[PDB]
């Protein structure tokens, strides 16, 4: 009845894709043209109900939208995990090198 909720989350899409509602912002360095600008936008405007909602962020240029489309399939959404998003941890989760 006592589960570690970060370990459970590793068994969802969170553990294999960039999760728009939970993943720390450094992960957006993994794909091209996504960091820092879009990654800043994406984290600010979370949460999302489906991956496709990212494209309805006001302000996107049409090149920004194109970049997002090229990467929609690296994205997932899962329920916000309080433990992963409190404390500003989406911007700095204590991991460096």
């Amino acid at each position: 009845e006592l589960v570690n909720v970060v370990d459970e989350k590793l068994g969802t899409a969170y553990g294999e894709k960039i999760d728009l509602n939970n993943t720390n912002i450094a992960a957006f360095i993994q794909y091209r043209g996504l960091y820092p600008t879009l990654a800043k936008l994406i984290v600010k405007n979370a949460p999302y109900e489906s991956v496709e909602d990212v494209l309805n962020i006001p302000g996107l240029t049409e090149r920004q939208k194109q970049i997002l489309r090229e990467n929609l399939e690296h994205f997932t959404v899962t329920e916000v995990e309080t433990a992963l998003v409190e404390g500003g941890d989406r911007y700095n989760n204590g991991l460096y090198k």
Partner: peptide, 22 residues
């Protein structure tokens, strides 16, 4: 009112939520 400690907090025997021994 979020948790007083956040997820990286390690207790005195190395146990944590987002880090540490289980």
């Amino acid at each position: 009112v979020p948790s007083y400690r956040t997820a990286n907090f390690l207790d005195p025997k190395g146990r944590g939520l987002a880090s540490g021994y289980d």
